[PDB]
Amino acid sequence: SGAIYVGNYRVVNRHLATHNDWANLVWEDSSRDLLVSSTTAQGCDTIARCDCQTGVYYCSSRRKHYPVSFSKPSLIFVEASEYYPARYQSHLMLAVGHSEPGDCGGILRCQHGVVGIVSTGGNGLVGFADVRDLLWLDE
Numbered sequence: 001s002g003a004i005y006v007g008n009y010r011v012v013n014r015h016l017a018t019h020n021d022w023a024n025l026v027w028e029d030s031s032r033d034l035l036v037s038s039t040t041a042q043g044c045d046t047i048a049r050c051d052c053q054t055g056v057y058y059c060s061s062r063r064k065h066y067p068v069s070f071s072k073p074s075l076i077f078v079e080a081s082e083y084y085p086a087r088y089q090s091h092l093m094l095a096v097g098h099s100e101p102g103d104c105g106g107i108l109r110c111q112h113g114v115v116g117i118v119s120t121g122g123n124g125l126v127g128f129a130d131v132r133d134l135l136w137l138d139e
């Protein structure tokens, strides 16, 4: 679990979106595993606007933050899950590192801010759904 709170937006993994998220839906993209909903209170997180390929992510299955080198956002084949069939997920960044399903939502950050959130993993890899191209979160 985990979310990003910026302005009047709540960014969560689409497969973990709640009834409240869907009733206050702003945008969703199943190929990115992202959903944004509207909130009453203002959020205090800052989205990174950069091409950083190093950062730190929160790993709930380890109660630890880990430093990682990650790939640029691209179309990567994501294995069939209980939430989605086999498919290419776009705007996904891979890193060598630990993850388990309950880790989705953990934030990946650089000096510039929130880079994205854990969305895929397995076999010693962790995939993050990028949020840096979504400039409308700033306004």
Ligand SMILES: NC(=O)[C@H]1CCCN(C(=O)Cc2cccnc2C(F)(F)F)C1
Pocket (backbone or CB within 6 Å): 015, 033, 078, 081, 082, 083, 084, 089, 099, 100, 101, 102, 103, 104, 118, 119, 120, 121, 122, 123, 126, 127
């Ligand atoms: N974006 C996706 O298709 C998600 C759908 C449901 C969640 N999901 C996974 O369970 C992938 C997975 C399997 C084994 C270890 N770690 C992970 C993960 F949690 F992502 F880190 C992929």
Ligand SMILES: [Zn+2]
Pocket (backbone or CB within 6 Å): 048, 049, 050, 051, 052, 110, 111, 112, 113
């Ligand atoms: Zn950065």
